[PDB]
Every structure is written in structure tokens, then in C-alpha cells.
Amino acid sequence: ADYDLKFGMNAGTSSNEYKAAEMFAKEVKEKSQGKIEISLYPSSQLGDDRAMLKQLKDGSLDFTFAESARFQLFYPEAAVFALPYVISNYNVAQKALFDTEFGKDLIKKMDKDLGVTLLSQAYNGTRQTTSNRAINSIADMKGLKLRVPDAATNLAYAKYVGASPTPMAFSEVYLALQTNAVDGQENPLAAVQAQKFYEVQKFLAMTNHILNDQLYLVSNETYKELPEDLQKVVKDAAENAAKYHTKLFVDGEKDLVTFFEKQGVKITHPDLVPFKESMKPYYAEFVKQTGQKGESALKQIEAINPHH
């Protein structure tokens, strides 16, 4: 094609993210009259999300996914998106990004400093905790060997609830769980399904601890080469795909617990009051580390009403 473009992702071929990227790819090809074709590179083939963001910056990858929280790698205050229990729901995540001074500035920095244009935002689920033993209460976390992604906020979740974290790439998790090298992991229900972690985890606890969004990002190096009519095709397709993406997640959260029960998983509902209480020293550490910019981001986000 005139523009042979590439979209990389950690998510695999059975995932919601991939299904929505397929919708995006198909719409772009159709509405560009074949000028643009987007090929998908799932399952971390190109590296992880940190690697893929560098490739968008350099212009060697055209599209990728990232959470708003992942930008904590560059702007420490952006950890606010994934401080456990701070963002209440997806309504709040949307307004945090687009309707706060903090979020608007973050979007501008991503363009100026990181070489990426934000096309759309979707919901990617609320993270839960799977394990090889029941989590009936916060006590059951103590010493649990909990795999985390290589992200500070997930590491802190694990630390502050009393678990023993092991960071590792998404691609390595299934084997770690299968072999009981670790005792558990944490991800939204849709990922537990997509990765088939239910095959190798007997328990699932509704910890509801971190809310993931998902940004459709394009390399500025690529986006600047597309004539404006094709920029609009791409932008409009990303917005349409994001709405679909969100719906996939919302619908799964309604019935995936029954799916997991049919696969033999035992579901628990630990009291979350101690889980929330356990994060209070972490929020204080965040404020100490990130200073006024972090205090401000927190205040801006805490001000958002969660009801539509």
C-alpha cells in the first residue's frame, strides 16, 4: 500500500484490544480507499509497551497502545492514574485525562516530548487478583508471591497490601503461574480470559484495585506524513474503535465471573476497606516524591464526580 503501517501491542490475538485494533485497521483501509493498510503485531512481538512507545517516538512503529498511567515513566505525577483506589471509575478516568488542567498538559507533553499523538481513549478494564489459594481477606495477601508488570504503581499495590511482588513481562506470566513460580497475578477479567490465566489459577478475588484506560497512539513521524484527509480517516477510525473497545470491556465485566465459575474458578469478595486503608501511606509517599505537581494532580482528580 501507499502507507504500510504497523500497530504493536502486548495483548494477544484472543483479546478485546486486538479485536478493536482489527476494527480500526479495517475502517482505515476502507475509508482511505486502500491507501493505508495497518498490520497488527500482538503478543509483545516488538517488545513491551515501554519499547513500543520508544518506537513510536523514533518513528519505526506507527501505532500502539498505552495507559495514561504509563506516562509516569516520564512525568512522575502521572502515577495518579494508577494509584490504587484513587480513580473511581472510567467516567473519572475520561475526565481526568481530557477535562483537567493536569490531563490536558499531559496530552501536550506526550506530543512535544514523546513524539506521540493521542487519537482516542478507551476503557481496558478494572484489575482483579487471581491466585493459587483463596484470598478471603487482606490477611491472605501476606507473603503471596504476586506477579506484577514492570510498573511502579502495580509494585506498590503489591507491597502495600503485604504481598511479595515479582515484576515480569506479560508474555512470561502464564508459565510463571503454571509452574507456581509465583502464586498470583493481577489484571482485568478480560485479560484473565484472553491469556487463559483461568487455566492455571483456581481463585479470583474482586480487589477492584486499579482502573485501566487505553490510549490509541500514533507516531508523530507517521501522522505528519499523512495528508489531512487521511489524518481525519485515522482519527475518526480511532474514535470509533475506542467506543467499541470500551463496550467490549463493559459487557465482559457483566458476565465473565459466570464464565470463570464454569471453568472451575472460585470467586471471592474480600472486604476492601483494609485494602484501601493500606494505600494511605502510599498516597503520602507519592505526594512526598512528586511534590506540588502530584498534590495538584490528585486534587484535580479527587474533585471529579464519578456519576455520569
Ligand X SMILES: CC(=O)N[C@H]1[C@H]([C@H](O)[C@H](O)CO)O[C@](O)(C(=O)O)C[C@@H]1O
Specify the residue, 70 or 209, whose C-beta has the smaller distance to ligand X.
70
Cβ proximity of 205 and 131 under 8 Å: yes
Specify the residue, 66 or 161, whose C-beta has the smaller distance to ligand X.
66
Q: Dihedral, CA atoms, 254, 260, 262, 264, nearest 10 degrees?
A: -160
* Separation of alpha carbons 39 and 8, rounded Å: 9
Note whether 71 binds ligand X by CB under 6 A.
Answer: no
Here the contacts of 269-276 (C-beta below 8 Å, separation 24 or greater) are 269/205, 269/206, 270/135, 270/136, 270/137, 270/138, 270/140, 270/205, 270/206, 270/207, 271/137, 271/138, 272/207, 272/208, 274/137, 274/138, 275/84, 275/85, 275/138, 275/161, 275/207, 275/209, 276/84, 276/85
Which range in 59-67, 244-252, 254-262, 277-285 contacts ligand X by CB under 6 A? 59-67
CA 233 to chain centre: 25
User: Minimum CB separation from ligand X for residue 74, in Å?
Assistant: 13
Q: Which of 5, 6, 7, 10 binds ligand X (CB under 6 A)?
A: 10
70 in a labelled binding site: no
Q: Which of 87, 93, 151, 158 binds ligand X (CB under 6 A)?
A: 151
User: Minimum CB separation from ligand X for residue 78, in Å?
Assistant: 11
Note whether 53 binds ligand X by CB under 6 A.
Answer: no
* Separation of alpha carbons 136 and 26, rounded Å: 45
Note whether 235 binds ligand X by CB under 6 A.
Answer: no
User: Minimum CB separation from ligand X for residue 101, in Å?
Assistant: 23
Q: Which of 24, 65, 123, 249 binds ligand X (CB under 6 A)?
A: 65
User: Minimum CB separation from ligand X for residue 67, in Å?
Assistant: 4
Q: Which residue has the cell 465471573?
A: 257
Residues 157-176 that bind ligand X (CB under 6 A): 170
Note whether 66 binds ligand X by CB under 6 A.
Answer: yes
Which range in 60-68, 93-101, 111-119, 246-254 contacts ligand X by CB under 6 A? 60-68
Specify the residue, 194 or 233, whose C-beta has the smaller distance to ligand X.
194
Note whether 216 binds ligand X by CB under 6 A.
Answer: no
Strands 63-66 and 211-219: antiparallel
Partners of residue 175 on adjacent β-strands: none
Binding mask 97-136 toward ligand X (x if CB under 6 A, else -) reads ----------------------------------------
User: Minimum CB separation from ligand X for residue 305, in Å?
Assistant: 26
80-113 burial, b for 16+ CB within 10 Å, e for fewer? bbbbbbbbbebebbbbbbeebebbeebbeebeee
User: Minimum CB separation from ligand X for residue 284, in Å?
Assistant: 22
* The dihedral sign for the CA sequence 105, 108, 110, 112: negative
SS3 258: helix
Going by the annotation, the residues of the binding site for N-acetyl-beta-neuraminate are 10, 49, 67, 127, 147, 187
Going by the annotation, the residues of the binding site are 10, 49, 67, 127, 147, 187
Q: Which residues bind ligand X (CB under 6 A)?
A: 10-11, 49, 65-67, 69-70, 149, 151, 170, 187, 191, 214
